Amino acid sequence: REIITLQLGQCGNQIGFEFWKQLCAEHGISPEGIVEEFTDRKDVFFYQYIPRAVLLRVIHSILNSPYAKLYGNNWASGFSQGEKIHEDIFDIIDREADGSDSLEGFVLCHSIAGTGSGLGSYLLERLNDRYPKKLVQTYSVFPVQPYNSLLTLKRLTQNADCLVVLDNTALNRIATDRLHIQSFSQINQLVSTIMSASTTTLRYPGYMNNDLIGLIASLIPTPRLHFLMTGYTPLTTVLDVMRRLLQPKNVMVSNHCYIAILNIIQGEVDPTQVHKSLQRIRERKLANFIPWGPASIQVALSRKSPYLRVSGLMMANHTSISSLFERTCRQYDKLRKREDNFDEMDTSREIVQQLIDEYHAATRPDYIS
C-alpha cells in the first residue's frame, strides 16, 4: 500500500517540504535523492528514490534549494481557478495512482485561512467523485479569514475521511513560551515533528498498525466525529511520558470528555513495563471518558531513527474541539450583520451547526439516537 501526499498553498508547500526533509534525514536518503551507505520500510512514502508528492513563487525557492533533485485571497477565487484546470492536475494524480501498486489514501497538507484553501475545497470534492474507496486524511492548519475558514469546514465535515487539527495560536504560544522566538520557519519545526511522528508506526513495521486505517479505525467512532488533536511532550520511564501528555500545557489546542486516545512512544524504553503503566494510570483517573459506549487508552511503541532518548505523541478525540468551531461560527455572524445568491454560505453555516450539535450531544448518557 502507498499514500500520495498533496501540498496546497504557501503553508502546505512549506510544512510539506519540511516534512520531507525530516523524513529524508530520518531515513538514509541523501539530499540528491540517492541512498547513502551508512530495515525501515520506506516503500509507502518513497517510490523506487522519489517522493510521491504533488506540489501545487514558493516552488522556485524550493527548486533553488539543495533539495531540487527530490521531485488572490478569496475562497470563490480559489474554487473557480481549480475548475478551469480540473483536467490538468488530475493527469498528474491519475498517472501516480495507476503507477502505484495499491493506493490507500491521500494526505493533504493545507491551511484553511486563501487561494490554497479554495483549491483544497474543490479537490476534496472531486476525489469523492472519482475514487470512492480511498481515505482522505487532511493535516489542516487553523489561523475575511472567518468566511474562508467556515466554507472549507463545510467540505471537511463530509468529504475528508479524517482530520488532524493544528492551530497557529497554540503553536505560536509554545514558541514564545519554551523557545523564546521574541517566525514561520521556526514554528514549522514543531509541525514537522508532529507530522513525522504521526506516521511512525507505518514506516517501522511492528505487530500492529501496519496500515493507515489501523490507526483511524480505533479513534473515530462515527463518520461525523472525525476531528483529532495532538500532544507532544519533550520540548525516562513510560509512566512519566503518559502523565506529561495528559496535562493541558502540552496540547496543541487553545462538560467535556475523551472518546479515544492513542499514544506513540518512540524511545528505547523497556517494553515490559508498558502494560504496568496502563494499570496505574487507570487508578488515578486522569481522564474522563464517554458514558454511553466503552472507550480506552492506546499505547504503541516504535523505534527512533538510528541515523539521527525518549519522545512521545498523543492523538486524542476530545469533544472540547467543538469550541474552536464556535469561535469561527460566532465570528461569522458578527460579519454577516455588518457587510449571485450567497446561499452556499447559508448551507455551510447550517451544516457546521449540526456538527457542533453532535459534539455537545456526544457527551450525554443517551447519545444513542
Partner 1 sequence: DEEVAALVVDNGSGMCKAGFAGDDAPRAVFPSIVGRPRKDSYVGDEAQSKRGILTLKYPIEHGIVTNWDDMEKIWHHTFYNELRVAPEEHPVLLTEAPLNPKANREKMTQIMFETFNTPAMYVAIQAVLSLYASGRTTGIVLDSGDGVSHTVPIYEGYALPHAILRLDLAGRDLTD
| Footprint on this chain of ligand GDP (rule: CB under 6 A) | 9-11, 14-15, 111, 113-116, 141, 143, 168, 184, 187-188, 191
Name the phi and psi angles at 353, rounded to 5. -65, -30
| 39 near partner 1 (CB under 8 A) | no
> Are the beta carbons of 168 and 187 closer than 8 angstroms?
yes
Residue 113, contacted partner among ligand GDP, partner 1, none, CB below 5-8 A by kind: ligand GDP
| 268 near partner 1 (CB under 8 A) | no
Closest-CA residue to 188 (of 179, 31, 308): 179
Q: How far is the CB of 71 from ligand GDP (least distance, A)?
A: 19
Residue 62, contacted partner among ligand GDP, partner 1, none, CB below 5-8 A by kind: none
Residue 230, contacted partner among ligand GDP, partner 1, none, CB below 5-8 A by kind: none
Residue whose cell numbers read 530520518: 26
Q: How far is the CB of 27 from partner 1 (least distance, A)?
A: 14
Which residues are CB-contacts of 204 (< 8 A; sequence separation ≥ 6)?
A: 39, 40, 41, 302, 303
Number of residues interacting with partner 1: please give it, by CB under 8 A: 4
- The annotated binding site for GTP is made up of 113-118
Q: How far is the CB of 145 from ligand GDP (least distance, A)?
A: 7
* Nearer Cβ to partner 1 (234/267): 267
Go through the chain and tell me how many residues it has: 369
* Nearer Cβ to ligand GDP (116/221): 116
- Look at the alpha carbons of 116, 119, 124, 130 in this order and tell me if their dihedral is positive or negative: negative
| 37 near partner 1 (CB under 8 A) | yes
Q: How far is the CB of 361 from partner 1 (least distance, A)?
A: 55
How far is Cα 149 from Cα 145, in angstroms, rounded to an integer?
A: 6
| 184 near partner 1 (CB under 8 A) | no
* Nearer Cβ to ligand GDP (111/250): 111
* Nearer Cβ to partner 1 (72/306): 306
Q: How far is the CB of 205 from partner 1 (least distance, A)?
A: 20
Residue 307, contacted partner among partner 1, ligand GDP, none, CB below 5-8 A by kind: partner 1
* Nearer Cβ to partner 1 (204/258): 204
Q: How far is the CB of 7 from ligand GDP (least distance, A)?
A: 11
How far is Cα 225 from Cα 222, in angstroms, rounded to an integer?
A: 6
Q: For partner 1, which residue of 38, 284, 309, 342 counts as binding (CB under 8 A)? A: 38
Residue 188, contacted partner among partner 1, ligand GDP, none, CB below 5-8 A by kind: ligand GDP
| 307 near partner 1 (CB under 8 A) | yes
Q: How far is the CB of 113 from ligand GDP (least distance, A)?
A: 3
Residue 266, contacted partner among ligand GDP, partner 1, none, CB below 5-8 A by kind: none
Q: How far is the CB of 38 from partner 1 (least distance, A)?
A: 6
* Nearer Cβ to partner 1 (292/307): 307
Q: Which residues bind partner 1 (CB under 8 A)?
A: 37-38, 306-307
